[PDB]
Amino acid sequence: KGDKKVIQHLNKILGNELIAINQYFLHSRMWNDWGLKRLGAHEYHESIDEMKHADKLIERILFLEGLPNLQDLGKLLIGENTQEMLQCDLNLELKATKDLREAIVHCEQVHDYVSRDLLKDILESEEEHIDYLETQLGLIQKVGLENYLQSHMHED
Amino acid sequence: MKGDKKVIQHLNKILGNELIAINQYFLHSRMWNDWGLKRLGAHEYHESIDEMKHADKLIERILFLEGLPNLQDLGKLLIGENTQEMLQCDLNLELKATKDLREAIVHCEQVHDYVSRDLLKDILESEEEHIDYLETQLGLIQKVGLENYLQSHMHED
Amino acid sequence: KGDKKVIQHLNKILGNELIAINQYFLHSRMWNDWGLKRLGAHEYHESIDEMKHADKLIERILFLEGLPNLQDLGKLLIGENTQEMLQCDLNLELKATKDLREAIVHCEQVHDYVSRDLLKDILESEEEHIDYLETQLGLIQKVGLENYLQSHMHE
Amino acid sequence: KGDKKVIQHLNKILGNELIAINQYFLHSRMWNDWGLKRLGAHEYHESIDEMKHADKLIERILFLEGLPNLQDLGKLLIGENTQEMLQCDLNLELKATKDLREAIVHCEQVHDYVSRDLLKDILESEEEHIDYLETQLGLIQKVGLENYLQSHMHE
Amino acid sequence: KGDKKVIQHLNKILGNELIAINQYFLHSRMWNDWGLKRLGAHEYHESIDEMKHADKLIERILFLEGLPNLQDLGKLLIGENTQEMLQCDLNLELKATKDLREAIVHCEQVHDYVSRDLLKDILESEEEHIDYLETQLGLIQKVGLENYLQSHMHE
Amino acid sequence: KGDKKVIQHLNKILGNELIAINQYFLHSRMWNDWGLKRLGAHEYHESIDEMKHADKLIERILFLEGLPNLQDLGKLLIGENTQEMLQCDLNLELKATKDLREAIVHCEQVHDYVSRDLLKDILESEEEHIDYLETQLGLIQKVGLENYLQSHMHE
Amino acid sequence: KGDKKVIQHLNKILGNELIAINQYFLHSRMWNDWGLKRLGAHEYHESIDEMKHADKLIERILFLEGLPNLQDLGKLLIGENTQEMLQCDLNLELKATKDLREAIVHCEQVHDYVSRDLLKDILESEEEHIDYLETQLGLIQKVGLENYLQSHMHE
Ligand code: HEM
Ligand code: HEM
Ligand code: HEM
Ligand SMILES: [K+]
Ligand SMILES: [K+]
């Protein structure tokens, strides 16, 4: 019933969300470990958001009578300090966003407009995340790394 | 520096088992929902959430002990194709998890990591509760027949 | 001081309650084990009711100056499946109820009208239990074993 | 699923709990009969606690695929006055505690860590009871028997 | 029209209530006089309860078309210290309870089941009071009279 | 009666807690003096936590019929600046935690599973304390000492 | 900077409070162990009060640029029964109170009127403590030791 390449696209986006869930979750727990609790909580909330996207992808694939793939897990990008963690998340999101545009082009072409609408809602969320990530990296330049980390020791 | 290395390897192994379980239970949940078996869908969803909570505690402990949590390696999901197989797959998964937990606890005891032991014991209790639930559902399928069992799980509450 | 045979009757009724406590408590936990939670909860309340009747019997025996006998525990009738368990409970209650009638006769004869009244209240409760049991057995015939068990999975 | 000697240990601890349930329940009603209502209420809660321990044991045994034994009831130690009743409870709890330790040794050996944990929680609660018991007997010595009883007349 | 001998029995139980009202009332105010206020309050409440039994007997006699007798007051057993006051109440209750069993035999025999039920409720109450009285006498022995009285100074 | 070596081990853990109580309290008060109020409040909570541990140890020793030793006070590790204070706290907890492991091995050996459980709960809280301390020292490196102290001026 | 001798005196009072904290805490816990819960609770409150005094002394020393001494712990006076425990507490407070007077004279002399005021507040609370202690010892004589202990069993 679903278009076969729409389902391949939905699984591919799903594969991206599955990487992100784990990467964000680890980076969150690394920040907590280091006592940078505000970064930790924020990253924890990014990880939950990716879990909610994966749910919606999984529900759609199953309705389209595809088989969701949660077995393949691509490469986690894990940073070694706060700057690299944030850059690692940004590299993940730039790739996820590219795959999202490509999935949407194809849904349009086979008139799977509901799948298209779902991917656009994810894409808007991923662009907000890009903005958060770029912004954090800019603040590191503007206030200095030590100040930036200080401002993230204590939770909101 | 602080953690025993084999404790860490044990913890990453349990964590690996939790990560399979998260994905397996989450897909079985959504498969059950897709079929309109909503009470099963919701119960399996809560099993998946509980495994996510246990992964979180293991990750925090690994990191305290100065090890590196492994979330990169995902072992084999046991995906069933109908209700009876999905339950059995979950049970086969738990029986392996539970064996692994016992071996870890043995080792924690040996090297005096009594806090890690205690965490693993709480997870074990919780996995043994799951085994009870799983075995009970399979026994009920026998006692009330599959059609009734499935009917009793169409609606939530 | 109570009539000595009244006390022996009170101790016999208590002996029956003590069997029922343990038999119903085990049947309750067997049903919970099997995922038949409504049967398990009902059977648990029947066990608690037998505990309360044992308590009244103990209090009365002590007031009458007798020795409550909590030591001798008779035979538990344990079933291996739902129909057997309900039938065992019924067999137990049919025996308890005969003992209650015999005891009441004796309290009447020696003018122990308070013990009689106490035993009549337990008898009413036991007859309502017989009714519940006979009814479950009937429902099993009417709706079929698998339906009947299905109806007792969720609390 | 269960290890067979784990199950025998669980049934033995269960057996000890069945004795304590009855012994404390009777001691409770005996204190009440005498108008020592505060000892009565205390002992009633000790009995209820042992009922909850038995429940947890039954459920564990059934999950491990054993047969809970509620049929065998060992010897109740019943005292004839307050000093002896407290000593009988203490002697019962010293033996309980010893069996709980041997059972935990065995769970540990065959890696039944959940059964071990359950028995350790029971043990903590039996050691609290030993403390209450030892303490009442020391109070009998410190304040005198008549005072001690007087302090236990009113709830 | 009631049975004649039913009515005679009801008026007899009523005379026992009228003695008891006045004896418990006086014992209460003697206790209050001495500053044993807990005994005084408890005894007040026993007196009020006898008043309520008397009222039920009066109503029933009048419904059966008899004449209630409140003129013939029997012998009050008034003690001169706590121990005697309590034994007096208990001597009065043993008699009351015996007259009660007789009335009930007679009601059974002429089929006055409602009068019988009324007398049985009173008998249960009178047996509770026997329990209280025997308990108190027991306590004086176990805790010593001085302690027993001290425990009844404050309400 | 407890095992003699368990009481020595409990007394040794107690000894460690008595040192920590005083060392944490003084560091707390030194932080408040310098106007580093958040550090002062955190450290006061740590000192309070050790006071609670000490209390449980004391209750347990006495139950076991031992004599709690509150007389021997070991050596306080008092730093003179924030970095040294934190490291002295960590040096203390490293020793405390080693001693707790050795106690727990002995308790397991002689089957004192309640003592073991108590010590394990204290160990888990001491380990959480080590985490806090290692984390703050690391934050000093990541944010710089001046920013780290500034972040602990206000509560 | 405070006067050097005032800091020595504050450190000496502090020293007394550290002894009292531990001595009162242990007596508290010994009373709870024996089931004299009211004495145990009162004594715990006394130990807490000394902890608050110690805190104020510590804050004041540091303000005055001195070094609080929490390392030297003088000699605990631990009794072995209730009467001795009370007298050991009074023996402690008699010394503490003498030392506080000598401190206050010195503070007055060098014009440290805030220190003096702090010490006077501690002296008033130590004097209230002496009153409590002398009162309990007198009550032991007036009511007898058995009644006195009985009056302190329940909180
Ligand atoms: C590293 C693997 C994962 C970890 C460590 C993890 C952890 C967590 C935690 C701690 C929570 C909050 C649980 C609570 O306390 O209520 C949560 C929620 C949730 N998770 Fe995961 N999770 C993981 C993977 C997944 C995956 C693969 C999915 C795929 C569907 C998923 C779906 C969800 C959903 C839907 C929620 C509820 C979110 C909400 O609405 O609040 N999670 N997870
Ligand atoms: C196999 C032996 C027994 C078991 C397993 C058992 C189990 C239980 C349980 C689980 C409860 C509820 C307690 C709570 O959580 O609050 C209870 C209550 C109680 N039991 Fe038992 N019980 C047993 C025997 C007895 C016996 C022999 C007596 C005799 C008097 C008794 C008298 C009572 C009473 C009066 C209550 C409170 C009932 C109420 O709610 O009014 N029990 N029991
Ligand atoms: C220099 C030594 C000590 C200092 C400065 C100190 C100070 C304090 C303070 C200020 C409090 C809070 C009191 C309140 O606000 O009501 C407290 C509470 C407490 N202290 Fe200590 N104390 C000391 C020694 C001890 C010791 C040796 C013990 C051993 C048992 C102890 C046991 C406790 C307990 C159980 C509490 C109540 C904690 C709670 O809230 O649960 N104290 N202490
Ligand atoms: K700054
Ligand atoms: K007295």
Distance between CA G14 and CA G88 in Å, rounded?
Answer: 19
F48 lines ligand 3 (CB under 6 A): yes
Residue B155 has a CB neighbour count (10 Å cut-off) of 10
Give the other-Cβ count within 10 Å of D75's Cβ.
Answer: 9
DSSP letters spanning chain D: ---HHHHHHHHHHHHHHHHHHHHHHHHHHHHHHHT-HHHHHHHHHHHHHHHHHHHHHHHHHHHTT-----S--------SSHHHHHHHHHHHHHHHHHHHHHHHHHHHHTT-HHHHHHHHHHHHHHHHHHHHHHHHHHHHHHH-HHHHHHTTS--
Q: How far is CA A45 from the centre of its chain?
A: 11
Helices (H) and strands (E) in chain F, counts: 5, 0
**Across chain A, how many H-helices and E-strands are there?**
5, 0
Q: How far is the CA of B54 from the centre of ligand 1 (A)?
A: 11
Chain D residue nearest residue C48, CA to CA: D51
Residues 6+ apart with CB under 8 A from A43: A24, A25, A27, A28, A31
Rounded CA-CA distance E124/E49 in Å is: 12
Residue A147, marked binder: yes
Q: How far is D102 from chain F (nearest CA, A)?
A: 9
Q: In angstroms, what is the resolution? A: 2.1
Q: How far apart are CA C76 and CA C84, in angstroms?
A: 13
Nearest CA in chain G to F21: G70
Question: Where in E29-109 does DSSP place strands (E)?
Answer: none
Instruction: Test D29 with C70 for CB contact under 8 angstroms.
Output: no
Residue type for position D47: S
Written as six digits, the tokens of B155 are: 């609606």
E-only strand ranges, chain E: none
Is residue D83 within 8 Å of residue D25, measured between CB atoms?
A: no
Interface check for B148 against chain C (CB to CB < 8 A): the answer is: yes
Q: Are A28 and A47 in contact (CB under 8 A)?
A: yes
The maximal CA–CA distance of chain B, rounded, in angstroms, is 57
* C-beta of F69 in contact with ligand 3 (< 6 A): no
Looking at residue F16, the DSSP 8-state letter turns out to be H
Largest CA distance in chain A: 55
Cα B77 to Cα E33: distance, rounded to the nearest angstrom:
86
**CA C55, C57, C63, C65 torsion-angle sign:** negative
Burial (CB count within 10 angstroms: exposed 0-12, middle 13-18, buried 19+), residue B39: middle
G62: alpha, beta or left, given left = phi > 0 and alpha = psi -120 to 50?
Answer: alpha
Please name the chains neighbouring F, where neighbouring means 3+ C-beta pairs under 8 angstroms: A, B, D, G
Q: Other C-beta atoms within 10 Å of B29: how many?
A: 24
- With CA atoms as reference, report the closest residue to D42 among D138, D141, D143, D128: D128
Structure tokens at G37: 């819960």
Do residues B44 and B32 lie in contact, with contact meaning Cβ atoms separated by under 8 Å? yes
Q: How far is CA E139 from the centre of its chain?
A: 21
End-to-end CA distance of chain D: 47
Go through chain F and tell me how many residues it has: 155
Tokens (6 digits) for F147: 């920013």
Q: Which of A97, A69, A93 is nearest to A8 (CA)?
A: A69
Of the candidates F59, F12, F118, F16, which has an alpha carbon nearest to the alpha carbon of residue G25? Answer: F59
- Give per-residue burial for D118-152: e unless 16+ CB within 10 Å, then b: bbbebbeebbebbbbbbbbbebbebbbbbbbbbbb
- How many CB atoms are closer than 10 A to CB C55? 16
Asked if A touches F (at least 3 Cβ pairs < 8 angstroms), the answer reads: yes
D11 to chain F nearest CA, in Å? 20
CA triple D26-C6-C130, angle to 5 deg: 80
Question: Residue E49: which of E9, E21, E8 has the closest Cα?
Answer: E21
Q: Inter-chain contact D147–E148, Cβ cutoff 8 Å? A: no
Atom in ligand 2 nearest the alpha carbon of residue D58? 5
Closest chain D C-alpha to E81 CA, distance in angstroms? 20
**C17 token code pair:** 């309650």
**Distance in angstroms (rounded) separating the CA atoms of residues G18 and G76:** 10
Ligand having the closest approach to the CA of A19: 1
Nearest CA distance, D31 vs chain G (angstrom) = 19
Does residue G27 have a known ligand-binding role?
A: no
Q: Supply D20's token pair.
A: 């304590």
- Give just the sign of the alpha carbon dihedral E36, E41, E42, E48: positive
Q: Can you give the C-alpha Rg of chain D in angstroms?
A: 17
What is the greatest pairwise CA distance in chain F? 54
Structure token pair of residue B49: 């959430």
Q: How far is the alpha carbon of F149 from chain A, nearest alpha carbon, in Å? A: 10
Cβ separation D153–E135 shorter than 8 A: no
Residue pair C68/C57 in contact by the 8 Å Cβ criterion: yes
Residue nearest to atom 28 of ligand 2 (CA): C51
How many whole angstroms separate alpha carbon F78 and alpha carbon F84?
8
Which residue in D3, D18, D35 sits closest to D105, CA to CA?
A: D3
Is domain C1-155 annotated with CATH 1.20.1260.10? yes
Whether F113 has its CB under 8 Å from any CB of chain D: the answer is: yes
Torsion sign, CA atoms C133, C134, C135, C141 = positive
Contact A125, A57 (CB under 8 A): no
What DSSP string runs through B39-94? HHHHHHHHHHHHHHHHHHHHHHHHHHTT-----S--------SSHHHHHHHHHHHH
CB contact under 8 A, C35 and B149: no
The three-state DSSP-derived secondary structure of chain C is CCCHHHHHHHHHHHHHHHHHHHHHHHHHHHHHHHCCHHHHHHHHHHHHHHHHHHHHHHHHHHHCCCCCCCCCCCCCCCCCCHHHHHHHHHHHHHHHHHHHHHHHHHHHHCCCHHHHHHHHHHHHHHHHHHHHHHHHHHHHHHHCHHHHHHCCCCC
Query: Could you tell me which chains touch chain C, where touching means 3 or more CB pairs under 8 A?
Result: B, D, E
The alpha carbon of F55 and the centre of ligand 3 are apart by a number of angstroms equal to 10
Ligand nearest to the CA of A70: 1
Q: How far is CA A113 from the centre of its chain?
A: 22
Smallest CA–CA separation between C105 and chain D, in Å?
27
For ligand 2, the distance from its centroid to the CA atom of residue G112, given in whole angstroms, is 68
- 3-state DSSP: chain G helix, strand, coil percent, rounded to 5? 80, 0, 20
Judged by CB atoms closer than 8 Å, whether chains meet at D58 and C22 is answered as no
- Contact indicator for B102, B38 with CB cutoff of 8 Å: no
Q: Is D55 on the interface with C (CB under 8 A)?
A: yes
- What is the G108 CA–ligand 1 centroid distance (Å)? 68
Please state, in angstroms and rounded to a whole number, the distance separating the CA atoms of residues C104 and C115. Answer: 8
Beta-carbon pairs below 8 A across chains B and F:
15
Nearest chain C alpha carbon to D32? C59
CA distance B49 to A62: 20
| Angstrom distance (rounded) from CA C14 to CA C96 | 10
Going by beta carbons, is chain D in contact with chain A, meaning 3 or more pairs sit under 8 Å apart? no
Residue among A27, A19, A10 nearest A73 (CA): A19
Running DSSP on this structure, what letter comes out for residue G81?
S
A1-156 is a CATH 1.20.120.340 domain: no
Give the residue from D83, D87, D88 showing the smallest Cα distance to D22.
Answer: D88
Q: How was this structure determined?
A: X-ray
Name every protein residue with a CB atom under 6 angstroms from any ligand 2 atom: C 18, 21-22, 25, 48, 51-52, 54-55; D 18, 21-22, 25, 48, 51-52, 54-55, 70
Q: Please check whether residue D93 is in contact with residue C63, taking contact to mean a CB–CB distance below 8 angstroms.
A: no
Atom 32 in ligand 3: which residue has the minimum CA distance? Answer: F51
Candidates B135, B134, B5, B144; CA nearest to B68 is: B5
Contacts of A149 in chain F (CB under 8 A): 139, 142-143
With left for phi above 0 and alpha for psi between -120 and 50, is residue G112 left, alpha or beta? Answer: beta
User: Are the CB atoms for G29 and G40 separated by under 8 Å?
Assistant: yes
Which residue, E145, G30, E143, is CA-closest to D144? E143
Mutate to test the interface with B, among A30, A57, A70 (most CBs of B within 10 A): A70
The CATH fold of domain B1-157? Ferritin (1.20.1260)
Phi-psi region of A75 (alpha: psi -120 to 50; beta: other; left: phi over 0): beta
Provide, as residue numbers in chain F, all residues whose Cβ is less than 8 Å from the Cβ of A154: 151
CA–centroid distance, F87 to ligand 2, in Å, is 55
For ligand 1, whether the C-beta of B56 sits within 6 Å is yes
Closest residue, chain E, to D34 (C-alpha): E135
Contact predicate F40/F25, CB 8 Å: no
Compute the half-sphere exposure of residue B79: CA atoms within 13 Å on the CB side of its CA: 13
Closest residue by Cα to residue C32 from B67, E88, D61, E45:
D61
Where b means 16+ CB within 10 Å and e means fewer, F91-125 reads ebbeebbebbbebbebbbeebbbbbbbbbbebbee
DSSP E138: H
CA distances to A71, A147, D5, F94 from F139, rounded to whole Å, are 38, 12, 53, 20
Question: Would the CB of B15 count as within 6 Å of ligand 1?
Answer: no
How far is residue A83 from each of residues A138, B72, F134, measured CA to CA in Å? 11, 21, 21
State whether A29 and B60 contact (CB < 8 Å).
yes
F91 touches chain A (CB under 8 A): no
Q: Is B102 on the interface with D (CB under 8 A)?
A: yes
Q: Which chains touch E (3 or more CB pairs under 8 A)?
A: C, D
Cα A51 to ligand 1 centre (Å): 6
Tokens of C32: 């919970």
Closest protein CA for atom 29 of ligand 3: F51
Q: Which residue has the tokens 């959430």?
A: B49
- Mutate-to-test residue for ligand 2 from D21, D27, D32, D76, highest number of ligand atoms within 8 A of CB: D21
Ligand 3 atom 40 nearest Cα: F48
Report the nearest-CA residue for atom 42 of ligand 2. Answer: C51
